Amino acid sequence: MDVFMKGLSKAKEGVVAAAEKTKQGVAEAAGKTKEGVLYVGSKTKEGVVHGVATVAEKTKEQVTNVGGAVVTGVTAVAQKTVEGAGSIAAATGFVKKDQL
Amino acid sequence: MDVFMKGLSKAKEGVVAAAEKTKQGVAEAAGKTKEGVLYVGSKTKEGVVHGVATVAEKTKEQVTNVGGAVVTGVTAVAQKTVEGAGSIAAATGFVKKDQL
Amino acid sequence: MDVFMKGLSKAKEGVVAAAEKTKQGVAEAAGKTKEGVLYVGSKTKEGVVHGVATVAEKTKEQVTNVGGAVVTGVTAVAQKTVEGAGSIAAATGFVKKDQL
Amino acid sequence: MDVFMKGLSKAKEGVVAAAEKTKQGVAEAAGKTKEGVLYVGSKTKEGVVHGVATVAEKTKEQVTNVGGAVVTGVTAVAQKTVEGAGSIAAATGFVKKDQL
Amino acid sequence: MDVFMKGLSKAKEGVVAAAEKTKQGVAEAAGKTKEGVLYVGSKTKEGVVHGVATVAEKTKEQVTNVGGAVVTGVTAVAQKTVEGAGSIAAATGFVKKDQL
Amino acid sequence: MDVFMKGLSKAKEGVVAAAEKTKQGVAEAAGKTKEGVLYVGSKTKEGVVHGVATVAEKTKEQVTNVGGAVVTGVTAVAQKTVEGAGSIAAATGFVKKDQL
Amino acid sequence: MDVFMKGLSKAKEGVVAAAEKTKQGVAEAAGKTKEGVLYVGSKTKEGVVHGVATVAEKTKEQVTNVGGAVVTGVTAVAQKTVEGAGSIAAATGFVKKDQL
Amino acid sequence: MDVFMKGLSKAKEGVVAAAEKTKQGVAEAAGKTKEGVLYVGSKTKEGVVHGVATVAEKTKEQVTNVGGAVVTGVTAVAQKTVEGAGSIAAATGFVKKDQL
Amino acid sequence: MDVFMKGLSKAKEGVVAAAEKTKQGVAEAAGKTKEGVLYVGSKTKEGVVHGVATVAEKTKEQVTNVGGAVVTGVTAVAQKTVEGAGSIAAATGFVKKDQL
Amino acid sequence: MDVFMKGLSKAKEGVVAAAEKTKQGVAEAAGKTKEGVLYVGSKTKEGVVHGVATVAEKTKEQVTNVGGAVVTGVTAVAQKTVEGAGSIAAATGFVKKDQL
Amino acid sequence: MDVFMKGLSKAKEGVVAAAEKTKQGVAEAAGKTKEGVLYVGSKTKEGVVHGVATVAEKTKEQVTNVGGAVVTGVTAVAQKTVEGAGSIAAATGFVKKDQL
Amino acid sequence: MDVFMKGLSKAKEGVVAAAEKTKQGVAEAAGKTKEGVLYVGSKTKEGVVHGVATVAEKTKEQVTNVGGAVVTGVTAVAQKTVEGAGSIAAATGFVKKDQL
Amino acid sequence: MDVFMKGLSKAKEGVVAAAEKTKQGVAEAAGKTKEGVLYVGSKTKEGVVHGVATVAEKTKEQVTNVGGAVVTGVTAVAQKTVEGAGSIAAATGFVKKDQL
Amino acid sequence: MDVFMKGLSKAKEGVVAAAEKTKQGVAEAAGKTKEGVLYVGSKTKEGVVHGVATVAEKTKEQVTNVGGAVVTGVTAVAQKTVEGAGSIAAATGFVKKDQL
Amino acid sequence: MDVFMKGLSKAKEGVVAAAEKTKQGVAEAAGKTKEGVLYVGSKTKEGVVHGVATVAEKTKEQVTNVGGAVVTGVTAVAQKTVEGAGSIAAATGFVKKDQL
């Protein structure tokens, strides 16, 4: 009555150029819980921005965003409010409770 | 009465150029729960933005967004409010409870 | 009375160029629950934006979004409100409860 | 009385260029539940935007969205309100409860 | 009645050029919980920004953001407020409680 | 028994682009007289002359006028001759002669 | 028994681009007289002359005028001749002669 | 029995780009007289002359005027001749002669 | 029985770029007279002359005027001849002669 | 029975870039007279002359004027001849002669 | 049995100005044969070409031949082909074979 | 049985100005044969070419031949081909074979 | 049985100005043969070329030949090909074979 | 049985100015043969070329030949090819074979 | 049975000014043969070239030949090829073979 886990990665020509959260032979349990969280952001991989020209002869205002992945003008809230009573979050990877 | 898990990744010519959350031989349990969360963002992969010209001769306002993946002007809320009583979230990978 | 899981990835010429959430030999349980969440965003893969010109001679306002995948002007809410009593969310990968 | 699962991915010339949520030999349980969620967004794959010109000689307002996949001006809500009593969501991958 | 875990990484020609959170033979438990957190930021990998020219002849205001991945003008909050009573978050990797 | 005159010009977005002799809140008396005068001339506002080609292979004379508003070859006289006796010109804005 | 005059010009966004003899809150008397005068001339505002080509292969004479507002070849006289006796020109803004 | 005059110019965003004889809150009397005068001239505001080419292969004479506002070849006289007796020109702004 | 005049110029963002004879809060009397005068001249404001090419292969005469505002070949006289007797020019701003 | 005049110029952001005869809070009397005068000249403000090429291969005469505001070949006279008797020019700003 | 031949040229005033193949007392035999020959050419005697003018203003091609005797654009062949057997050409001046 | 030949040229005033192949007392035999020959050429005698003018203003090609005797653009062949058997050409001046 | 030949040239006033191949008392045999020959050329005698002017203003090509006798652009071949068997050419002046 | 030949040239006033191949009392045999020969050339006698002017203002190519006798651009071949068997050319002046 | 030949040249006033190959009393045999030869050249006698002017203002190429007799641009071959068997050329002046 045991627990056994492993991960092999025998590799000859391995290339992971521009990646994120890659698993190449693993064994996880990975329990996770999030009550109030918030992700804001822009990611780019193998992007190219070649040649940009902006002029303004006689103006009162001019804004500009050009990059490969842009995010502008956001307003977010993220909350969990337990104002009465009782709140439980288990988030268990795996349970093993066996008798004999 | 045991638990066994593994993952192999024998590989000869492997290429993962621009990727995200890739699994190439794994064994997971992966329990997860989210009460109030919020994702805002723009991602791009192998994008190209070549040649951009914006002018403004005599104006009062001019805005511009050009990039390969844009997000602008959002307003989001995300919440869980337990104001009375009682709230449970299990989110279990896998259970094994066997007798004999 | 055991549990057995594994994943193989013998590979000769593997190419995963621009991908997301790819599985190439896995074994999961994957319990998950979401009460109030919110996804907003724009993604692009192998996009190309070549040649963009915007001018404004004599105006009072001019906005512009050009990129390969755009999202603008959203207003979303996402909530779960338990104001009385009682709320349960199991979200179980798999159960194994066998006697003998 | 056991549980057995696996996934093979013997591959010679594999190409996954621009994809999302691809499985090439897997074995899942995958329980999932969502009470109140919300997806807003635009995705593009192998898109091309070549040649764009917008001018405005003498105007009071001019807006423009051009990209390969656009989304603009949305207003969504998504909620689950349990204000009385009682709410259950099982969302189970698979159950195995056998006697002998 | 023991616990056994390991990870191998026999490798001949390994290249991990520009990556993040990569695992090449591991064995984890990985319990984690987050009550109120907040991620804001822009990441880029193998990006190129070649050739940028912005001029302003006679104006009152002109802003500009050009880089490969930009994020501007955000306003986020992230909170968990337990103002009544009771709040628990387990977030367990894996449990093994077996008798004999 | 007084005289009162004024002129207001409260203005939010005022634009007078190409104009002449414009009054936007005034109070005048404006007496004027002209015995012998003479106006000759050409005026243009927001005119455009784009693309003009004139050739002359083998000629003895060739004249040309092209501009947006042309005036050519005039011969005018303007006179007032008082050779006897008596000539009066009042040209009064406004008179106020009241007794009591 | 007094005289009162004034002019206000409260202004928020005022623009007078290419104008002439503009009054935006005034109070005038403006007596004026002209016996013999003469105006000759060409005025232009916001004009554009783009692209002009004139050639002359083998000629004896070729004249050309192209500009936005042209005036050519005039011959004017303007005179007032009082050769006998008596000539009066009042040109009064406004009179106020009141008794009591 | 007095005289009162004033002019205000409270201004927030004032722009007078290319103008002439503009009044923005004034109070004038402005008596003026002209016996023999003469104005000749060409004025231009916000003009543009872009691209001009004139050639002459084998000719005896070729004249050319191109500018935005041209005036050429005028012959004017302006005179007032009082050769007998008597000539008066008042040109008064405003009179105030009140008794009591 | 007095005389009172003033002029205010409270100003926040004032811009007078290329102007002439502008009054922004004044109080004048301004008597003026002109017997024989003469104005000849060309004025330009915010003008542009870009690109001018004139050639002459084998000719006997070639004249050219190109500038934004040109004046050429004028012949004017301006005179007032009082050869008999009597000539008066008042040109008074404003008179105030009140008894009591 | 007095005379009172003043001029204020409270100013926060004042800009007078290229101007002439500008008054920003004044109080004048300004009597003026001109018998025989003469103005000849060319003025320019914010002008630009970019790129000028004139050639002459084999000619006998070639003249050229290019600048932003040109004046060429004028012949003017301006005179006042009092050869008999009597000539008066008052040109008074303002008179105040009140009894009591 | 002999052969006798002679030629006399007693001459007093002989003139041969411009000639060709002239005989003035001769005695010939003159055997001749020609199998394949070819004469091309132009001859002139006592010719005169006085005054020739050719011009070409603007053309793509112009050819000209003027001389007293011209020959242009010929294409001739001249041949004798004996490809079988037998070919004789005697061409004898004169034979004298007499017996006795 | 002999052969006798002679030629006399007693001459008093002999003139041979411009000639070719002239005989003035001769005695010939003159056997000759030509199989494949070719004469091309132009001859002139006592020719005169006085006054020639050719111009070309603006052309792409212009050829010219003027002389007293011209020959241009010929293409001739001249051949004798004996490819079988047998070919004889005698070309004898004169034969004398007499017996007795 | 002999052979006798002679030539006399008693001459008093002999003139041979410009000639070619002239015989003035001769006695010839003159056997000659030509298999493949070729004459190309131009000859002139007592020629005159007085006054020649050729100009080219602006062209791409201009050729010219003027002389008294011109030859241009020829292409000739001249051949005798005996490729089988047998070819004889006698070309005898004169034969004398007499018996007795 | 002999051979006798001679040539006399008694001469009083002999003039041979510009000549070629002239015989004035001769006695020849003159056997000659030519298999493959080629004459190219220009000859002139008593020629005159007086006054030649060629100009080229602005061209790409201009050729010119003017002389009294010109030859240009020829291409000739001259050959005799005996590739089989047998070829004879006698070319005899004169034969004398007489018996007795 | 002999051979006798001679040549006399009794001469009183002999003039041979500019000549070539002149015979004035001769006695020849003159056997000659030419297999492959080639003459190229220009000859002139008593020629005159007076006054030559060539100019080139602005060109890319200009060639010129002027002399009394010119030859330019030739390409000739001259050959005799005996590649089989047999070739004879006699070319005999005169034969004398007589018996008795």
* DSSP letters spanning chain J: --EEEEE---EEEEEE-S-SSEESS-----EEEEEE--EEEEEEES-EEEEEEE--SS-S----B-SSEEEEEEEEEEEEEE-SB--EE--BS-EE----
Other beta carbons within 10 Å of D100: 7
**Tokens coding C94:** 């798999």
- The count of CB pairs under 8 A between chains B and C is 415
Closest CA of chain M from K60, distance in Å:
9
Closest CA of chain O from M12, distance in Å:
10
Residue type (1 letter), O57: E
Q: Give the span between the Cα atoms of K7 and L23, in whole angstroms.
A: 10
Q: Give the span between the Cα atoms of O31 and O23, in whole angstroms.
A: 17
Cα distances from C64 to residues C49, C53, C75, E67, in angstroms, run 14, 11, 19, 19
Other beta carbons within 10 Å of O63: 11
Cα distances from K87 to residues F43, M57, O85, in angstroms, run 101, 61, 21
Strand partners, D89: C89
Strands E11-16 and M48-54, by their bridges, are unpaired
Beta-strand ranges (E) seen in chain A are 3-7, 11-18, 22-23, 31-36, 39-45, 48-54, 69-82, 88-89, 92-96
Residue type (1 letter), H13: E
H or E element in which residue J50 lies: strand J48-54
User: Which residue of A3, A71, A83 to mutate against C (max C Cβ within 10 Å)?
Assistant: A71
Q: Give the span between the Cα atoms of N35 and O87, in whole angstroms.
A: 11
**Tokens coding A85:** 């009573």
- The count of CB pairs under 8 A between chains B and D is 9
- Alpha-carbon dihedral B81, B84, B90, B91, rounded to 10 degrees: -20
Strand partners, K94: L94
- All partners of chain N with 3 or more CB pairs under 8 angstroms: L, M, O
Flag if K1 and M70 touch (Cβ within 8 Å).
no
Cα distances from C15 to residues C18, D6, K65, in angstroms, run 9, 22, 77
B/e letters for I30-69, b = 16+ CB within 10 Å, e = fewer, are: bbbbbbbbbbbbbbbbbbbbeebebbbbebbbbbbbbbbb
For B78, counting Cβ atoms within 10 Å of its Cβ (0-12 exposed, 13-18 middle, 19+ buried), the class is: buried
For N58, counting Cβ atoms within 10 Å of its Cβ (0-12 exposed, 13-18 middle, 19+ buried), the class is: middle
8 Å CB contact between M89 and M35: yes
8 Å CB contact between A45 and E45: yes
- Name the residue among L78, O27, F34 with its Cα closest to residue H91: F34
| Whether J70 contacts chain H with CB within 8 A | yes
**Furthest-apart CA pair in chain H: how many Å?**
85
Q: Give the span between the Cα atoms of N21 and N24, in whole angstroms.
A: 10
Strand partners, C34: B34, D34
Give chain A's length. Answer: 100
8 Å CB contact between G91 and F91: yes
Q: Give the span between the Cα atoms of K37 and K42, in whole angstroms.
A: 17
Q: Give the span between the Cα atoms of I55 and L19, in whole angstroms.
A: 59
Residues of chain D contacting C25 with CB distance shorter than 8 Å: 7-9, 24-26
Whether there are 3 or more C-beta pairs closer than 8 Å between B and D is yes
List the single residue in E with minimal CA-CA distance to B78. E78
Whether there are 3 or more C-beta pairs closer than 8 Å between A and B is yes
Cα distances from O60 to residues I68, M61, N59, O73, in angstroms, run 41, 11, 7, 20
Question: At N68, phi and psi to the nearest 5?
Answer: -55, -30
List the helix and strand counts (H, then E) for chain M. 0, 9
B/e letters for E47-68, b = 16+ CB within 10 Å, e = fewer, are: bebeebebebeebbebebbbbb
Residues of chain M contacting L10 with CB distance shorter than 8 Å: 8, 10-11
Flag if E62 and A67 touch (Cβ within 8 Å).
no
Flag if C27 and D37 touch (Cβ within 8 Å).
no
8 Å CB contact between F54 and G56: no
Cα dihedral sign, L95-L96-M1-M5: negative
- Assigned architecture for domain B1-100: Orthogonal Bundle (1.10)
């994008």: which residue's tokens? B47
B/e letters for I3-21, b = 16+ CB within 10 Å, e = fewer, are: bbbbbbbbbeebbbbbbbe
Cα distances from B65 to residues B50, C65, G26, in angstroms, run 14, 5, 46
In the DSSP assignment, the letter for residue I91 is: -
Residues of chain M contacting N61 with CB distance shorter than 8 Å: 59-62
D98 in a known ligand binding site: no
Strands N39-45 and M39-45, by their bridges, are parallel
In the DSSP assignment, the letter for residue K23 is: B
Flag if N42 and O74 touch (Cβ within 8 Å).
no
Whether there are 3 or more C-beta pairs closer than 8 Å between J and A is no
8 Å CB contact between I45 and H45: yes
Q: Say which residues have a Cβ less than 8 Å from residue E43's Cβ, sequence separation at least 6.
A: A41, A43, A44, E20, E69
Flag if C42 and D41 touch (Cβ within 8 Å).
yes
Q: Report angle CA C83, C86, C89 to the nearest 5 degrees.
A: 110
Q: Say which residues have a Cβ less than 8 Å from residue B12's Cβ, sequence separation at least 6.
A: A12, A13, C11, C12, C13
Residue type (1 letter), N65: N
B/e letters for E23-43, b = 16+ CB within 10 Å, e = fewer, are: bbbbbbebbebbbbebeeebb
Flag if B14 and A11 touch (Cβ within 8 Å).
yes
Flag if E19 and A15 touch (Cβ within 8 Å).
no
**Tokens coding M94:** 């004169």
Residue type (1 letter), O66: V
- All partners of chain B with 3 or more CB pairs under 8 angstroms: A, C, D, E
8 Å CB contact between O68 and M49: no
- The count of CB pairs under 8 A between chains M and N is 425
Three-state secondary structure of chain N: CCEEEEECCCEEEEEEEECCCEECCCCCCCEEEEEECCEEEEEEECCEEEEEEECCCCCCCCCCECCCEEEEEEEEEEEEEECCECCEECCEEEEECCCC
8 Å CB contact between A57 and E55: no
Flag if D56 and C55 touch (Cβ within 8 Å).
yes
Three-state secondary structure of chain D: CCEEEEECCCEEEEEEEECCCCECCCCCCCEEEEEECCEEEEEEECCEEEEEEECCCCCCCCCCECCCEEEEEEEEEEEEEECCECCEECCEEEEECCCC
8 Å CB contact between M23 and N21: no
- Alpha-carbon dihedral F21, F25, F28, F30, rounded to 10 degrees: 10
Q: Give the span between the Cα atoms of J16 and H39, in whole angstroms.
A: 28
| Whether N2 contacts chain L with CB within 8 A | no
Q: Give the span between the Cα atoms of G6 and M74, in whole angstroms.
A: 102
In the DSSP assignment, the letter for residue H85 is: B
Cα distances from A17 to residues B19, E67, J25, in angstroms, run 9, 21, 70
Q: Resolution in angstroms for this experimental structure? A: 3.4
Strand partners, G80: F80, H80
Strand partners, I58: none
**Furthest-apart CA pair in chain F: how many Å?**
85
Q: Give the span between the Cα atoms of E86 and B84, in whole angstroms.
A: 12
**Tokens coding B90:** 């299990």
Q: Find the CB nearest E94 among B1, B9, B29.
A: B29
Q: Give the span between the Cα atoms of O68 and O43, in whole angstroms.
A: 9
8 Å CB contact between E55 and B54: no
Closest CA of chain B from C2, distance in Å:
4
User: Which residue of G61, G65, G97 to mutate against H (max H Cβ within 10 Å)?
Assistant: G65
| DSSP sequence for M23-36 | ESS-----EEEEEE
| DSSP sequence for L28-90 | ---EEEEEE--EEEEEEES-EEEEEEE--SS-S-B--B-SSEEEEEEEEEEEEEE-SB--EE-
Q: Give the span between the Cα atoms of F99 and O31, in whole angstroms.
A: 152
**Tokens coding O88:** 């004879």
Q: Say which residues have a Cβ less than 8 Å from residue M8's Cβ, sequence separation at least 6.
A: L6, L7, L8, L9, L10, L25, M25, N8, N10, N25
Whether there are 3 or more C-beta pairs closer than 8 Å between M and D is no
Flag if E76 and A77 touch (Cβ within 8 Å).
yes
| Whether B24 contacts chain D with CB within 8 A | yes
Three-state secondary structure of B27-64: CCCCEEEEEECCEEEEEEECCEEEEEEECCCCCCCCCC
Q: Give the span between the Cα atoms of M15 and O2, in whole angstroms.
A: 37
**Tokens coding M11:** 């001459």
List the single residue in O with minimal CA-CA distance to N22. O22
Beta-strand ranges (E) seen in chain G are 3-7, 11-18, 22-23, 31-36, 39-45, 48-54, 69-82, 88-89, 92-96
Q: Find the CB nearest F29 among H46, H94, H98.
A: H94
Flag if O94 and M29 touch (Cβ within 8 Å).
yes
Closest CA of chain H from J10, distance in Å:
10
Cα B100 to chain centroid distance, Å, stands at 42
Flag if B71 and A74 touch (Cβ within 8 Å).
yes
- The count of CB pairs under 8 A between chains H and I is 393
In the Cβ-directed half-sphere of K21, how many Cα atoms lie within 13 Å?
0
- Name the residue among O74, A87, F6, J41 with its Cα closest to residue H25: F6
User: Which residue of H66, H75, H95 to mutate against F (max F Cβ within 10 Å)?
Assistant: H66
Reduce the DSSP state of residue O18 to 3 states and report it: coil
- Name the residue among N22, J91, K46, C59 with its Cα closest to residue B58: C59
Closest CA of chain O from N69, distance in Å:
5
Cα distances from B98 to residues J60, K50, M14, in angstroms, run 116, 130, 151
- Name the residue among I63, I74, I40 with its Cα closest to residue G65: I63
Q: Give the span between the Cα atoms of M37 and L32, in whole angstroms.
A: 14
Residue type (1 letter), M90: A
Q: How was this structure determined?
A: cryo-EM
Residues of chain B contacting E70 with CB distance shorter than 8 Å: 67
List the single residue in K with minimal CA-CA distance to L12. K12
Q: Report angle CA O82, O88, O93 to the nearest 5 degrees.
A: 140
User: Which residue of L9, L20, L60, L66 to mutate against N (max N Cβ within 10 Å)?
Assistant: L9
Flag if B98 and D67 touch (Cβ within 8 Å).
no
Cα A23 to chain centroid distance, Å, stands at 15
Taking phi over 0 as left and psi of -120 to 50 as alpha, with beta for the rest, G98 belongs to beta
Q: Find the CB nearest M94 among K9, K29, K44.
A: K29
Q: Give the span between the Cα atoms of B8 and E25, in whole angstroms.
A: 9
Q: Give the span between the Cα atoms of D68 and D49, in whole angstroms.
A: 7
Q: Say which residues have a Cβ less than 8 Å from residue D44's Cβ, sequence separation at least 6.
A: B69, C43, C44, C45, C47, C68, C69, D67, D68, D69
Closest CA of chain A from C97, distance in Å:
9
Reduce the DSSP state of residue L2 to 3 states and report it: coil
Beta-strand ranges (E) seen in chain K are 3-7, 11-18, 31-36, 39-40, 43-45, 48-54, 69-72, 76-82, 88-89, 92-96
Reduce the DSSP state of residue M5 to 3 states and report it: strand
- Name the residue among G13, L4, E3 with its Cα closest to residue M1: L4
Q: Report angle CA G74, G77, G81 to the nearest 5 degrees.
A: 175
């990744």: which residue's tokens? B9
**Tokens coding J50:** 């970019």
First-residue to last-residue Cα distance in chain I: 10
Residues of chain J contacting H67 with CB distance shorter than 8 Å: 70
User: Which residue of F70, F98, F100 to mutate against G (max G Cβ within 10 Å)?
Assistant: F70
List the single residue in B with minimal CA-CA distance to C47. B47
Q: Give the span between the Cα atoms of H69 and H71, in whole angstroms.
A: 7
Q: Give the span between the Cα atoms of M26 and K15, in whole angstroms.
A: 20
Flag if A76 and B81 touch (Cβ within 8 Å).
no
8 Å CB contact between B44 and B18: no
**Tokens coding I95:** 């008179």
8 Å CB contact between K24 and L22: yes
Q: Give the span between the Cα atoms of K44 and K32, in whole angstroms.
A: 26
8 Å CB contact between H75 and I75: yes
Interface of B with E in 26-65 (CB under 8 A): 29
Other beta carbons within 10 Å of J96: 16
Strand partners, G43: F43, H43
Other beta carbons within 10 Å of L50: 16
8 Å CB contact between J96 and I3: yes
Q: Say which residues have a Cβ less than 8 Å from residue L72's Cβ, sequence separation at least 6.
A: K65, K70, K71, K72, K73, L65, M70, M71, M72, M73
Residues of chain G contacting I16 with CB distance shorter than 8 Å: none
User: Which residue of I58, I71, I83 to mutate against H (max H Cβ within 10 Å)?
Assistant: I71
**Tokens coding K19:** 């000639």
Residue type (1 letter), F20: E
Question: At J90, phi and psi to the nearest 5?
Answer: -80, -65
List the single residue in D with minimal CA-CA distance to B90. D90
